[PDB]
Design an enzyme around this catalytic site. Structure first.
Site, short mmCIF file in Angstrom:
data_model
loop_
_atom_site.label_atom_id
_atom_site.label_comp_id
_atom_site.label_asym_id
_atom_site.label_seq_id
_atom_site.Cartn_x
_atom_site.Cartn_y
_atom_site.Cartn_z
N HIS A 101 0.84 -1.18 0.00
CA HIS A 101 0.00 0.00 0.00
C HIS A 101 0.89 1.25 0.00
O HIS A 101 2.09 1.17 0.08
CB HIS A 101 -0.85 0.00 1.26
CG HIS A 101 -0.03 0.13 2.52
ND1 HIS A 101 0.73 -0.90 3.01
CD2 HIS A 101 0.18 1.19 3.34
CE1 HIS A 101 1.38 -0.49 4.09
NE2 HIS A 101 1.01 0.76 4.34
N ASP A 103 0.66 5.19 2.18
CA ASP A 103 0.00 5.53 3.45
C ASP A 103 -1.18 6.49 3.27
O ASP A 103 -1.09 7.46 2.49
CB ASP A 103 1.03 6.05 4.48
CG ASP A 103 1.76 4.92 5.20
OD1 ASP A 103 2.61 5.23 6.06
OD2 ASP A 103 1.50 3.69 4.88
N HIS A 260 4.73 0.17 -0.21
CA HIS A 260 5.56 -0.59 0.72
C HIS A 260 4.69 -1.63 1.43
O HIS A 260 3.46 -1.55 1.39
CB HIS A 260 6.27 0.37 1.73
CG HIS A 260 5.31 1.17 2.57
ND1 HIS A 260 4.74 2.37 2.13
CD2 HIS A 260 4.79 0.94 3.81
CE1 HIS A 260 3.91 2.81 3.06
NE2 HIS A 260 3.95 1.99 4.11
N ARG A 275 8.11 7.08 13.49
CA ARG A 275 8.05 7.69 12.24
C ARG A 275 7.40 9.07 12.32
O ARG A 275 6.41 9.28 13.07
CB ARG A 275 7.25 6.77 11.28
CG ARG A 275 5.88 6.34 11.86
CD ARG A 275 4.95 5.60 10.87
NE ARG A 275 4.29 6.56 10.04
CZ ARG A 275 3.69 6.27 8.90
NH1 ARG A 275 3.69 5.01 8.47
NH2 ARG A 275 3.14 7.23 8.20
C1 LIG Z 1 -0.12 3.77 9.08
C2 LIG Z 1 -0.93 3.33 7.87
O1 LIG Z 1 -2.12 2.56 8.22
C3 LIG Z 1 -2.18 1.27 7.72
C4 LIG Z 1 -2.51 0.22 8.58
C5 LIG Z 1 -2.53 -1.08 8.07
C6 LIG Z 1 -2.28 -1.30 6.73
O2 LIG Z 1 -2.25 -2.59 6.28
C7 LIG Z 1 -3.25 -3.37 5.84
C8 LIG Z 1 -2.88 -4.42 4.99
N1 LIG Z 1 -3.86 -5.22 4.53
C9 LIG Z 1 -5.16 -4.99 4.89
C10 LIG Z 1 -6.18 -5.82 4.40
C11 LIG Z 1 -7.50 -5.59 4.78
CL1 LIG Z 1 -8.77 -6.68 4.15
C12 LIG Z 1 -7.84 -4.55 5.62
C13 LIG Z 1 -6.83 -3.71 6.11
C14 LIG Z 1 -5.50 -3.93 5.75
N2 LIG Z 1 -4.53 -3.13 6.21
C15 LIG Z 1 -1.94 -0.26 5.86
C16 LIG Z 1 -1.89 1.02 6.36
C17 LIG Z 1 -1.28 4.45 6.89
O3 LIG Z 1 -1.95 4.14 5.84
O4 LIG Z 1 -0.87 5.64 7.12
O1 LIG Z 2 6.40 -2.01 9.76
C1 LIG Z 2 6.73 -1.73 8.55
O2 LIG Z 2 7.78 -2.19 7.96
C2 LIG Z 2 5.90 -0.83 7.71
C3 LIG Z 2 4.54 -0.55 8.28
C4 LIG Z 2 3.80 0.48 7.44
O3 LIG Z 2 3.15 0.21 6.43
C5 LIG Z 2 3.72 1.88 7.85
O4 LIG Z 2 4.36 2.24 8.85
O5 LIG Z 2 3.00 2.70 7.21
CO LIG Z 3 2.34 2.02 5.46
#
Ligand SMILES: C[C@@H](Oc1ccc(Oc2cnc3cc(Cl)ccc3n2)cc1)C(=O)O
Ligand SMILES: O=C(O)CCC(=O)C(=O)O
Ligand SMILES: [Co+2]
Ligand SMILES: C[C@@H](Oc1ccc(Oc2cnc3cc(Cl)ccc3n2)cc1)C(=O)O
Ligand SMILES: C[C@@H](Oc1ccc(Oc2cnc3cc(Cl)ccc3n2)cc1)C(=O)O
Ligand SMILES: C[C@@H](Oc1ccc(Oc2cnc3cc(Cl)ccc3n2)cc1)C(=O)O
Ligand SMILES: O=C(O)CCC(=O)C(=O)O
Ligand SMILES: O=C(O)CCC(=O)C(=O)O
Ligand SMILES: O=C(O)CCC(=O)C(=O)O
Ligand SMILES: [Cl-]
Ligand SMILES: [Cl-]
Ligand SMILES: [Co+2]
Ligand SMILES: [Co+2]
Ligand SMILES: [Co+2]
Lengths: 285, 286, 285, 286
Positions: A101, A103, A260, A275
Site C-alpha cells: 500500500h 500511506d 511498501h 516515524r
Molecule cells: C499507518 C498506515 O495505516 C495502515 C494500517 C494497516 C495497513 O495494512 C493493511 C494491509 N492489509 C489490509 C487488508 C485488509 Cl482486508 C484490511 C486492512 C488492511 N490493512 C496499511 C496502512 C497508513 O496508511 O498511514
Molecule cells: O512495519 C513496517 O515495515 C511498515 C509498516 C507500514 O506500512 C507503515 O508504517 O505505514
Molecule cells: Co504504510
C-alpha cells in the site's frame, strides 16, 4: 557524481543507502541538495547508524516538507508528530501494513513522504518491502497508458477502520493503533489513477488494494477486473527492493511514487520503529 | 405487433424471434420483405419454422440480405458452391464445429454480415445453437468503461482454427464439413475495432471473440489477455443469450456483426446436417 | 418407451416436456410411475396447459414427497405451502434468484424438489435457466473427482438475508420476500461437496455461489480459488437448458442435482408464478 | 547461535543465511563442515562473502554436498565441463536467463539437489537473485488443502525452454551461456510428485514451477491450470521470499528441491558473470 554524501543504490529499480553524513548535525546547503536529489532519484533512501534524538528526527523530516501525523497511529508521549510502529513480542493480532500500500490515501491530501527510524528491531525478520510506481507506470504499453490515464479512483479507509473493518474478526492491537470513528473510516475521496509527481514531473501509477474501493464511474465487476490486473502488474518481484532494519537506521520513502509492505516474519520478537510523516498536496494528474 | 404482413414472436427480452405467416418458397412482396428486414435488424437472429425450400430458393432468399459469398473453411454441396454444410456423421469423434462463442470468419478483412442456416436433418433433441447480443454486451458496459475501450483495435487471425496453433495441437475437425487449408492463410492477421457501428442500424456493438482474436493491438500480451478475458466473461453472461432449437426445414438468419453464436455438442452418436449460405459484409468500422 | 405419457426431451443434457396427461385428474399407478421415472431421468420436467387449482398443485407436489415452504417467500392467503414468485410491473428492486443456485441450501435439509406453476407471465422474457450438477460432476476428470470428493462446504444465508445482506444497498421488494431475522440469515450448516442422489444413486456436484461461504477447513484464499473453478465449470453453457413459461405450465425440478436462475429480461412487465416445495433429507455423500 | 565453528547471520525469518568466519580456500575440518551442512539444511540458501577460490576449489567444495553433474542447457568454461556460466554481455538484448520463479532442470527424471554459484564479476547494483522456500509454501496450506493435493503428480518437460514451445515463440536466449539443444530432448516428459519429502531433512515441500510444469497428471487442461495457478500465487507471495545481492567472490549454495529462485533483470547494459557447479540429486519422492 555525489560529492557531499556517499550513495550506494540498492537495486537497478529503486532504493539507496546514504552514508558519509551525520544527521545529528545541521546539513549545509550542498549536503542537503544531494540528499534531496538522491531522494528524488532513488525514491527510498536510508541512513544506517544515525543515533538521533526525537527532536532531530522531527527537524530532519521538516526539511522534506510540513510534518503532520497520520490519523490511525499512536504517538510517543511529548511528541504528537512522532508516531509508533510497535509490536510487543507476545502479540497475536494482525501485523500493521502487511500488504502493499501507500500511506493514508483515503485523505484528500495523503502524505508526501514518511521518515522512519528503527528504535529496537530483531537481529533478523521484519524487513520492509518497497516498490516503484514509476516503474509500474513505465512498463505499461503506450496503448495501455492512453487507455487508463483519464480514470479516477475512489479511496476510503473502510477496510482499515470503517464498516468493513468492523465487519471482520481480525483486529489490530492497541499497541500502536488508535480507536477510530466509523464514519471517518468510510469517508470517500477521489484521486487520479495516474499522478504526476509535483517535484520530479515523472508519472506514477496510483492505486493500492488497502484503500482503493473502485474505479470511479465503473461497475463493481469492471473496476475489480482492471484494478486486479494493475495490482498484479505493479507488484511484480522485478519492481521491488527489500530493506533490512538495524537500530538507528533512518529511512525516508516517497509516499506518492512508491508502495511498501511490512514482512511479518518475526512472530514472537519485539519490534519498534518511530516515524514522522510529511504532508503532501492533493494528488494530481 | 407493429407487424402487419408477418407474425413475429420474440424469443427472449434480449434477442431472437420466430417468424411465421410467410412462405419462403414464394417470392416476397416489398411489404413482406421490409418487415422481415426490419425484424432482422430489431431482433438480430430470426428463424422461420416449416420452410421446405429448395437449395436455389435458399440462395435467392439469402441474396435479399446482401451479396452471397462462402466462408473459407467449409465444404460445399455438389452443384452449389455457395451452399455450405454443417454436417456431423453419427460416428464422428472429432471436435464439434463452432463449439465456443464466436462470430464467423473475423480473420477476414471483411467478415460476413449475416448467415442463413437451414436444417436438413437434425436430432429429435440436442444440437441447439446458442446466440448472444453484442449490442447488449456493449450497452451494459458503464459509460466510463465504454469511453475507456472505444479507441482500441484487436488483431484477428485464424491461427487456432487452421493456422500454426491448429497444426501444433492434437484435436482435429473431421473432413466431413471442413477443408484442408493453407497454414499461412491461417496465420494471416487483420485488425478490426473493438467497438463497431452497425452499417444499417447505426447501433454500436462490442466486437471480440476468443476463437479469432489474438490480442489488443499495441498492448502487451498480459494486458491484452486480461482485458479480453474480462470482456469475454462480460458478453457471455447467460442473461444476454438465447438458445435456438432446430427442427427439419427451419430456416434461420443471424447478424454476424452484432451477435455471437456457438454450437452445443450434446448429441454425440446422432446425425446432424444443416446447410448455410453466407452473406458478405464490409470492413467493420467504428 | 413411455406408454402412459408423452415425453419430449429438451436438450441432450437435461429437461423434458410432458404431455398426454391431465394433472387436474388423479393419476393411475402406471402414469405416476412414468412421471417419476421421467423426473429422475430428465431432472426438470414441465407440463404445458395444466389449469389446476391451488389444492391440486398441493396434492400433485405431495406425490413427490412431504411439502414444506422455504423460509424466505410469502405465501398466498389460505395456503401457507403455496409461495409466490411475483414481480409487479413497476418494480426496481433486485430480481429474485437471478444467479445460479439451488434453493435454501443453508438448511440442514434443503428441499428435494420444487413445483412451480405459471399464473400470469409475459408473452416473452422471464425464462428460467437450469443446469445439471450430474453433468458438472461427470465431466470432472477421475483425478479431479478423487481430489475433491472428501470435501465439505459451509453454507449460510448471510448474503440473502443475514449480515452481508444488511451491509449492501440493493434490496428485494416485499412483494414476495419476507422480512427475516439476521441470525437466522447467518446460521451455518455443512454439506458434502459431492452428494449421492438418494433415489437414483447418481453423484452430483453440490455447491452454489448464493449460499456457499467456504470449503470447510480451507483458508479463505484456497476455498475461494477451488469454488471459483467449480462455479465456472458447472455453469458452462453446454450444461444448461432454458425453459420458457406460458400460463398454467407446471414444472418440477430436482433441487439436489440441478441449479437454476431467473432471467431478468422483462423489466416493466408483471410476472407471477406460484410454487410448492418438497422437503428433502440431509444431503449426503 | 548454536554454531561454534562458523558465524551464521540469518537473512530473513523464513530462509537464507550469511556464513562468515571461514576460508573456503582451505580444507574444512569435520566440525566446520558439519555446521555448514547443518546451516544449509536449516536455512536452505546460504552464502559466503569474500571467498576468492579457484575453479578447482569451487568444484571440490561443491563435491562435499554430493556428486557434481552439469545441467543440460548451460555452456561451460574451457577446461572445466562441471563449471557452467551464467554470463550476460553488456550489449545483449536477448531474454535474461532464469527470470521467473523456477527450480533447476526439473524436466530431468532426477533434478539437481543443489547448486553452488560464485560471482566472478557483477554490477555495483542490479542482478540480485530472489529465493523462496517451498517448505513454507507447503506449511502455510491448510491441513485440509494439504490432504487434498498430497497424492497428485505433475508432468514436467523443457518444452518452453528448449522444446517445441520455445521453437514456436519469438524470444531467444543469446548463445553467451546457452547451448543449442535437441527439440525432442526439450519435449521429453517426466513425472514428479506435487509434494516431496526432502531426503535428508525429511521435511515436505511443495514441488511445482511454471517454467517446467506442464500439467497435473490425469487432470484436464482447465483443472490443472486452475490448481497450479493458485499454487504459484500462493508460493510466490513476497512474505516467503528473500533477495540476495551479489558481490565479487561471493559463493552461494541453494537447495534445488525445497526452494525456487529467479534472476532479477534490472541491470541491462551492465556486464554480469557468475559460474556454478550443480550437485546431482535422486528422483524426487513423496
Ligand atoms: C499507518 C498506515 O495505516 C495502515 C494500517 C494497516 C495497513 O495494512 C493493511 C494491509 N492489509 C489490509 C487488508 C485488509 Cl482486508 C484490511 C486492512 C488492511 N490493512 C496499511 C496502512 C497508513 O496508511 O498511514
Ligand atoms: O512495519 C513496517 O515495515 C511498515 C509498516 C507500514 O506500512 C507503515 O508504517 O505505514
Ligand atoms: Co504504510
Ligand atoms: C464456419 C466457422 O468456422 C469455425 C469453426 C470452428 C469454430 O469453433 C472453434 C471454437 N473453439 C476453438 C478453440 C480453439 Cl483452441 C481452436 C479452434 C476453435 N474453433 C469457429 C468457427 C467460421 O468462422 O466461418
Ligand atoms: C426462494 C429462494 O431464495 C433465493 C432468493 C434469491 C436468490 O438469488 C440471489 C442471486 N444472487 C445473489 C447475490 C448476492 Cl451477492 C446475494 C444474494 C443473491 N441472491 C436465490 C435464492 C431459495 O433459496 O429457496
Ligand atoms: C539453468 C536453468 O535453465 C533455465 C533457463 C531459463 C529459465 O527461465 C525461464 C523463465 N521463464 C520462462 C518462460 C517461458 Cl514461456 C519459457 C522459458 C522460460 N525460462 C529457467 C531455467 C535450469 O533449469 O537448469
Ligand atoms: O452447428 C451450429 O449450431 C453452429 C455452427 C457454427 O458455428 C457455424 O456454422 O458457423
Ligand atoms: O423466477 C424464476 O424463474 C426462478 C426464481 C427462483 O430461483 C426460485 O423460485 O427459487
Ligand atoms: O542469474 C541468476 O541470478 C540466476 C539464474 C538461474 O536461474 C540459474 O542459474 O539457474
Ligand atoms: Cl452475390
Ligand atoms: Cl562427482
Ligand atoms: Co460459426
Ligand atoms: Co431458486
Ligand atoms: Co535457475
Amino acid at each position: 557524481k555525489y560529492r557531499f554524501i556517499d550513495v550506494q543504490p540498492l537495486t537497478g529499480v529503486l532504493g539507496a543507502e546514504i552514508t558519509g553524513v551525520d544527521l545529528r548535525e545541521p546539513l549545509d546547503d550542498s549536503t542537503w541538495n544531494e540528499i534531496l536529489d538522491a531522494f528524488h532519484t532513488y525514491q527510498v533512501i536510508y541512513f544506517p547508524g544515525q543515533a538521533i534524538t526525537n527532536e532531530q528526527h522531527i527537524a530532519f523530516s521538516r526539511r522534506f516538507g510540513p510534518v503532520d501525523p497520520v490519523p490511525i497511529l499512536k504517538s510517543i508521549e511529548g511528541y504528537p508528530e512522532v508516531q509508533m510502529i510497535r509490536r510487543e513480542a507476545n502479540e497475536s493480532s494482525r501485523f500493521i501494513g502487511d500488504d502493499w500500500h501507500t500511506d493514508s490515501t483515503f485523505l484528500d491530501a495523503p502524505p508526501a513522504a514518511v521518515v522512519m527510524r528503527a528504535i529496537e528491531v530483531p537481529e533478523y525478520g521484519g524487513d520492509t518491502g518497497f516498490l516503484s510506481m514509476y516503474s509500474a507506470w513505465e512498463t505499461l504499453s503506450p496503448t495501455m497508458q492512453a487507455t487508463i490515464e483519464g480514470l479516477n479512483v475512489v479511496h476510503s479507509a473502510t477496510k482499515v477502520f470503517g464498516s468493513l473493518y468492523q465487519a471482520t474478526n481480525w483486529r489490530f492491537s492497541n499497541t500502536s493503533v488508535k480507536v477510530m470513528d466509523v464514519d471517518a473510516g468510510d469517508r470517500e475521496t477521489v484521486h487520479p489513477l495516474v499522478v504526476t509527481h509535483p517535484v520530479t514531473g515523472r508519472r506514477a501509477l496510483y492505486c493500492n488494494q488497502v484503500y482503493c474501493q473502485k474505479i470511479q464511474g465503473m461497475t463493481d465487476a469492471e473496476s475489480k477486473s482492471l484494478l486486479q490486473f494493475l495490482y498484479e502488474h505493479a507488484t511484480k518481484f522485478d519492481f521491488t527492493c527489500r530493506v533490512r532494519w538495524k537500530k538507528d537506521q533512518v529511512l525516508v520513502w516517497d509516499n506518492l511514487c512508491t508502495m511498501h509492505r511490512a514482512v511479518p516474519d518475526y512472530a514472537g520478537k519485539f519490534r519498534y520503529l518511530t516515524r514522522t510523516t510529511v504532508a503532501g498536496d492533493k494528488p494530481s494528474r
